Amino acid sequence: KETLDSFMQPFQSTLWLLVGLSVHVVAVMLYLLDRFSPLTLSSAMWFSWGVLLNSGIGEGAPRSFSARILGMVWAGFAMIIVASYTANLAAFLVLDRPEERITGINDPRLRNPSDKFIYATVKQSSVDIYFRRQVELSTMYRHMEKHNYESAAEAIQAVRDNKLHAFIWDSAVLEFEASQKCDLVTTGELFFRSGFGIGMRKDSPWKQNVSLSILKSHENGFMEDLDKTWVRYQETLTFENMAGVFMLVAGGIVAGIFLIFIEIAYK
Amino acid sequence: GSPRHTVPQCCYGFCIDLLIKLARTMNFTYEVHLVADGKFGTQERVNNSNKKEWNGMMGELLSGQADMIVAPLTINNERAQYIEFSKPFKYQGLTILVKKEIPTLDSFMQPFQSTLWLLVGLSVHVVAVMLYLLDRFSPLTLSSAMWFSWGVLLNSGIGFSARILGMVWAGFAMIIVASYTANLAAFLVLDRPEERITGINDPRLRNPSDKFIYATVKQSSVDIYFRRQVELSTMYRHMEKHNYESAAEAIQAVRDNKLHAFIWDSAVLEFEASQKCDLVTTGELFFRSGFGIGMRKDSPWKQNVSLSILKSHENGFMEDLDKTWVRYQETLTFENMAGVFMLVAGGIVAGIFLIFIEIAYK
Amino acid sequence: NGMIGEVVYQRAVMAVGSLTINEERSEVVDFSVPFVETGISVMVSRSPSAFLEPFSASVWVMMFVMLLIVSAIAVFVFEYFSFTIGKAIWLLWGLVFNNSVPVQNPKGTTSKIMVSVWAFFAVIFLASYTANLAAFMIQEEFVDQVTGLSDKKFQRPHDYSPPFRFGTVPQGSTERNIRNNYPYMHQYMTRFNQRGVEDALVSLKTGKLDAFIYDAAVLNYKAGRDEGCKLVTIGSGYIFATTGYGIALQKGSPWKRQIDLALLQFVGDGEMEELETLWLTGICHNEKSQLDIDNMAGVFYMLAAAMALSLITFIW
Amino acid sequence: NGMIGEVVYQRAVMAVGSLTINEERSEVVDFSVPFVETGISVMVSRSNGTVSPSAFLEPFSASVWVMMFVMLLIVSAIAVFVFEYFSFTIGKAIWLLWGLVFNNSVPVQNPKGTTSKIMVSVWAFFAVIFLASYTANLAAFMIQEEFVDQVTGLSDKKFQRPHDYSPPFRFGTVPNGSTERNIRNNYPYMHQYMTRFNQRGVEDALVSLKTGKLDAFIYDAAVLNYKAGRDEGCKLVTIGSGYIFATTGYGIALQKGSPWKRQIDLALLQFVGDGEMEELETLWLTGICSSQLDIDNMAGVFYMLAAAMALSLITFIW
Numbered sequence A: 001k002e003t004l005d006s007f008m009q010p011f012q013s014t015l016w017l018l019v020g021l022s023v024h025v026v027a028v029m030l031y032l033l034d035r036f037s038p039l040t041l042s043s044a045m046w047f048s049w050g051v052l053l054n055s056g057i058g059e060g061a062p063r064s065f066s067a068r069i070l071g072m073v074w075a076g077f078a079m080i081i082v083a084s085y086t087a088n089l090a091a092f093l094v095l096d097r098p099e100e101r102i103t104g105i106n107d108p109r110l111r112n113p114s115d116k117f118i119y120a121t122v123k124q125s126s127v128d129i130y131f132r133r134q135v136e137l138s139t140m141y142r143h144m145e146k147h148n149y150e151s152a153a154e155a156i157q158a159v160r161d162n163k164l165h166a167f168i169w170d171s172a173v174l175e176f177e178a179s180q181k182c183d184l185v186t187t188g189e190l191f192f193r194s195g196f197g198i199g200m201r202k203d204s205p206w207k208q209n210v211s212l213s214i215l216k217s218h219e220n221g222f223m224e225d226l227d228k229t230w231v232r233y234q235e236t237l238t239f240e241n242m243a244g245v246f247m248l249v250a251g252g253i254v255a256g257i258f259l260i261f262i263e264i265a266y267k
Numbered sequence B: 001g002s003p004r005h006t007v008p009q010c011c012y013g014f015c016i017d018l019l020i021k022l023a024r025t026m027n028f029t030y031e032v033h034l035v036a037d038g039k040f041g042t043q044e045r046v047n048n049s050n051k052k053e054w055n056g057m058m059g060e061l062l063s064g065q066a067d068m069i070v071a072p073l074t075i076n077n078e079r080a081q082y083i084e085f086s087k088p089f090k091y092q093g094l095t096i097l098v099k100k101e102i103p104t105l106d107s108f109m110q111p112f113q114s115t116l117w118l119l120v121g122l123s124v125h126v127v128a129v130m131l132y133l134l135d136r137f138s139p140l141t142l143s144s145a146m147w148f149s150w151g152v153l154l155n156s157g158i159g160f161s162a163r164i165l166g167m168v169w170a171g172f173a174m175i176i177v178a179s180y181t182a183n184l185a186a187f188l189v190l191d192r193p194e195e196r197i198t199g200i201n202d203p204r205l206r207n208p209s210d211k212f213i214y215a216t217v218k219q220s221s222v223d224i225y226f227r228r229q230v231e232l233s234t235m236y237r238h239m240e241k242h243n244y245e246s247a248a249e250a251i252q253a254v255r256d257n258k259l260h261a262f263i264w265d266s267a268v269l270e271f272e273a274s275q276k277c278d279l280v281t282t283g284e285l286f287f288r289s290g291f292g293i294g295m296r297k298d299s300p301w302k303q304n305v306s307l308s309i310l311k312s313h314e315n316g317f318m319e320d321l322d323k324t325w326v327r328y329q330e331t332l333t334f335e336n337m338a339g340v341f342m343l344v345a346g347g348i349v350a351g352i353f354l355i356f357i358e359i360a361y362k
Numbered sequence C: 001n002g003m004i005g006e007v008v009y010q011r012a013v014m015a016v017g018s019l020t021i022n023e024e025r026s027e028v029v030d031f032s033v034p035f036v037e038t039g040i041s042v043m044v045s046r047s048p049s050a051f052l053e054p055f056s057a058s059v060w061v062m063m064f065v066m067l068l069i070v071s072a073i074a075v076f077v078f079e080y081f082s083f084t085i086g087k088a089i090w091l092l093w094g095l096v097f098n099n100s101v102p103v104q105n106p107k108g109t110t111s112k113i114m115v116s117v118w119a120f121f122a123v124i125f126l127a128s129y130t131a132n133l134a135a136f137m138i139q140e141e142f143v144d145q146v147t148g149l150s151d152k153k154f155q156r157p158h159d160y161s162p163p164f165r166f167g168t169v170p171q172g173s174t175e176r177n178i179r180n181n182y183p184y185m186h187q188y189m190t191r192f193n194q195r196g197v198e199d200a201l202v203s204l205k206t207g208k209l210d211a212f213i214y215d216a217a218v219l220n221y222k223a224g225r226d227e228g229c230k231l232v233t234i235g236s237g238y239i240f241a242t243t244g245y246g247i248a249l250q251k252g253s254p255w256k257r258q259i260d261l262a263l264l265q266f267v268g269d270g271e272m273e274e275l276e277t278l279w280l281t282g283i284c285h286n287e288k289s290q291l292d293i294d295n296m297a298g299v300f301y302m303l304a305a306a307m308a309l310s311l312i313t314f315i316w
Numbered sequence D: 001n002g003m004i005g006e007v008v009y010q011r012a013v014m015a016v017g018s019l020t021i022n023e024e025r026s027e028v029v030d031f032s033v034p035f036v037e038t039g040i041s042v043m044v045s046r047s048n049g050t051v052s053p054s055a056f057l058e059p060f061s062a063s064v065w066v067m068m069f070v071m072l073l074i075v076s077a078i079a080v081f082v083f084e085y086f087s088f089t090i091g092k093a094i095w096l097l098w099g100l101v102f103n104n105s106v107p108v109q110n111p112k113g114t115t116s117k118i119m120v121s122v123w124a125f126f127a128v129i130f131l132a133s134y135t136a137n138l139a140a141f142m143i144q145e146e147f148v149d150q151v152t153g154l155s156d157k158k159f160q161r162p163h164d165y166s167p168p169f170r171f172g173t174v175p176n177g178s179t180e181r182n183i184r185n186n187y188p189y190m191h192q193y194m195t196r197f198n199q200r201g202v203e204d205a206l207v208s209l210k211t212g213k214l215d216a217f218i219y220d221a222a223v224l225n226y227k228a229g230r231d232e233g234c235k236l237v238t239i240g241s242g243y244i245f246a247t248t249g250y251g252i253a254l255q256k257g258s259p260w261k262r263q264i265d266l267a268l269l270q271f272v273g274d275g276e277m278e279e280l281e282t283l284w285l286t287g288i289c290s291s292q293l294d295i296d297n298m299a300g301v302f303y304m305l306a307a308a309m310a311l312s313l314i315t316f317i318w
């Protein structure tokens, strides 16, 4: 089941060009209202981009005897835009969770699989015979028999290299491998809750004391000690989101310093 | 209610106009009367002879005292083993009626905990006193320092390391109010849904308590469908203590908060949910049943009537009959404003009174 | 043709496979009891108006009432004891938002107290409005373009500048049902003819088809197995025929009563429900962009009205 | 006593009901194969908790701080360059620029060189999107929910002695049970502190846990999972799933010398080996799943107040 926040560069030319041309037209018509008075152009541009700035700037108030109404409308306009933008970007990055799992054997997409849901088992596995006995596992048996693998490490490398897409395996081993390799994430449901013992001979008197020694390991905390050996020991980021943001900010800073060189050469 | 009494009254609704449409289609007259009891009629034992008999609508039909049961009857297997049934016109399932949607104060200042708010106020007070002491130990000045502290605290009305630490505290307070904004956002993310588990296979429903009061209609086909089911002895013994004659009895019982669950048809309780919003249905569509017309045996008015219903299926007859009353139905800015407006108005009145006091002194 | 050409011509006994039920098919053979709720439905693909008039309906009034009260307070404070007589409106409504509006250095103590109280009120109102927009995004409805069989779009595709498209399989019973409802709908569907079911599925996935008409539960199954829940029906069979499926036996077949009782046994015990659980995928449930269009356009219309008001105040 | 006294003294054949497994029962009779994974578990009070709003390390993670310092130094250096083109905002430009992060800085007299205004506009748009991302992280923090548990596991310090912590508590078991035998074979001090805190009935112990007559209890795992699957209110979810517990099974104790044993084992492995045991577990085990939530934000208030007092001491001594 495995970036740039879509601010201006992944999003198309609606919001940035719209706000830029809008504040341009607003600044031009308010400076033309300043012409019809009932570095003044630079002061009007500073006032317009300070209202669009909405974070604090050491500016005054120009001759706005009738421009103040359009200025306050544009100010409330800009703040309700940036408030709605903050709200829906946050709510966009909250509910951005699609369906990226199988939910167990009861999946009709796996009852009738295709070339995408690649699931298989180990070659000559007891789970294969366990599914071959049962009454409805015929299509999954025909799907798994095509790509049986020798070792489980082959299955791990195949599902790591996107050759597989699902694999039936014991749960705690997959939890240990998820602790080791964090890219391998299983599903949530659990099935075939079974017991695993030791492959033994027929009825032997030493076999009885072997089973009693296993029970002696059960009654004390030595099973928990074996869990301490293997089972218990497990193992808005703005580094892809706001990193290229700072790259374009630094490029804009270099270009703005170049424009300041142009302005000082002009004046 | 009554031992035996009969009055002529007015009947209308769905199946009445359906019979009018049939009389427009097929040439026949009517004799419209009501069922004697308030039961569908189950296969109950008669008082002797160890024999079970049907009654109710079947008891009125099989006696020759009825010709056609024009009613959306739950067509089961058992009643079709005896007499012939028509084609089911209605496809309708089962649902559970509960009493949900019980909510406001929104935790702004007075429903919000003012202990940490007074802690923030005393903290910025101690910070302002300490910065005035650093002004005294320099390497309306007190009033200017207090006004600057309480103005930068609220980010409005704002006119060397002391101001640096004060602006550290100001950004810290903006972190505080951003956490407050997130807390008020988390206040209105979700409600409390599913106070009763709607799962029919819930072991909490299989072993109920004294609070779980669920009932059914006395002697219905739903009771027969439960009687077939081989593991429904517990709910049968529960609902037999609360056998209800009419469905309006269950409507009045859950209306007075005496019931908690009721197995019933879907669209009826959907229309009752349109009536009252606290009467809430469920979404589990189980036992998708077919409702037709109660009919006799092999009859010349059987196949013609079935073909008439089939001819009625193609047009929008059931469509605009659903448009009559079935389709016909009958957080925001307003919740989080009222007590806020009243508290801010009272604070403004008290502040103006304190300004009268201060101008009377100054 | 087909199963009707096999059973009625007595080369087949009955149609145990699925079959639609209508007038003349019931005239030629006898169907069984309905065992599944399969009407008809329309499949379409994936994909607010304003935020001031419905939402800020009556809060707007009390905000203006308290704004006039606080403005009268500021006028009385300035007139008790340098330009805040009529210019308190711009200052006060800039401090409504706290847009860092450059107005004046506040020397009035009562003015600073009222500005502090109103700024705290503005912060908590901004928090409440962000929570309102969050709950508005949580309450996420998905409206459709067509919510009616008697649509004005279903009368002429010149109703809107892109004409949409929808068809069925040829020589089908659904075509006969449409021709028994509207011949003009068949005339518009004549230009929208296509052959295959999965061919229409490929046309819906690639975008070579707008809408599609088929049965209800089969399209529900197709939407359950839909890759990414890209295809959602219009409703759940509201403005449709609401028919069913049966087993068409011959007129006079003695097996009809036993098969009907067997189907009534198979439905009313959870066996049919077990088969529906086994054979219907339902992962795509209900109630599950970054650029709205109508809201800022309506604010643009109010902005054009503000241009008109600015012109009125400029000429006089 | 009980079923062991019935079977071993040949008044009963076998116990079909659920039976615990230990060494002495395997010595006196013979168990069957296990079929269900039922260990032990501990039920606690587990009152109302929060989602622990401790801090945030997602945007910066103690690596973007150098970028903040470098960008402040560049802003101050170009402010010095504009001052060279143009009287006290050499280092104070950094103060104004970080005051405009939280949009309430005192406006120092800005030069007409306009370069400072451009970089203030760029940093101000960056502060707008930074506060937007901060509120977005605060909104995304609401998605998960988890309240911490008072017991880490079987090696708890609270399991050692509740005098080590400031509230003392209590814990009981079933009387005369094999769980008590497992305690006395593993932890004698647990039996010592459990003997004075005994109880009578399992549902009675549940009522004692609800009404407040008991704090903790030790029982089997899946039976308490079933009790949570019938719990009124569902306020009790046990810690873990048998990971720090015994994790034993349930079997059928047959008499030593019964020919039924292999047939019963084949029947149990047939009942498991077809999904019918899964059907029985589905039928008999089925369950579901504030104004002062800032109990860890106030720890951040404590640390920031201590850092503010320390920096005030540093700026005051010199």
Ligand SMILES: *[C@@H]1O[C@H](CO)[C@@H](O[C@@H]2O[C@H](CO)[C@@H](O)[C@H](O)[C@H]2NC(C)=O)[C@H](O)[C@H]1NC(C)=O
Pocket: A205, A206, A207, A209
């Ligand atoms: C299995 O181990 C047990 C324990 O050592 C043995 O059983 C008992 O052993 C003790 C000590 O040798 C004797 O006093 C008892 O008489 C034994 N009882 C039984 C069950 O006979 C047992 O001998 C061992 N069996 C083997 C050889 O594996």
Ligand SMILES: *[C@@H]1O[C@H](CO)[C@@H](O)[C@H](O)[C@H]1NC(C)=O
Pocket: B025, B026, B027
């Ligand atoms: C009987 O029905 C037929 C339907 O075509 C038609 O002749 C007329 O409606 C009816 N005639 C009588 C007997 O009124």
Ligand SMILES: *[C@@H]1O[C@H](CO)[C@@H](O)[C@H](O)[C@H]1NC(C)=O
Pocket: B044, B045, B046, B047, B048
């Ligand atoms: C018949 O009547 C008697 C009157 O007491 C009643 O007890 C009995 O249950 C009735 N039998 C049935 C079930 O018809």
Ligand SMILES: *[C@@H]1O[C@H](CO)[C@@H](O)[C@H](O)[C@H]1NC(C)=O
Pocket: B300, B303, B304, B307
């Ligand atoms: C309807 O009624 C007529 C006259 O009773 C009968 O002959 C016919 O079979 C029925 N149905 C049809 C096919 O019209």
Ligand SMILES: *[C@@H]1O[C@H](CO)[C@@H](O)[C@H](O)[C@H]1NC(C)=O
Pocket: D175, D176, D200
């Ligand atoms: C536990 O065992 C003792 C043995 O004397 C007995 O007296 C007591 O009643 C038992 N308690 C219970 C309730 O198990």
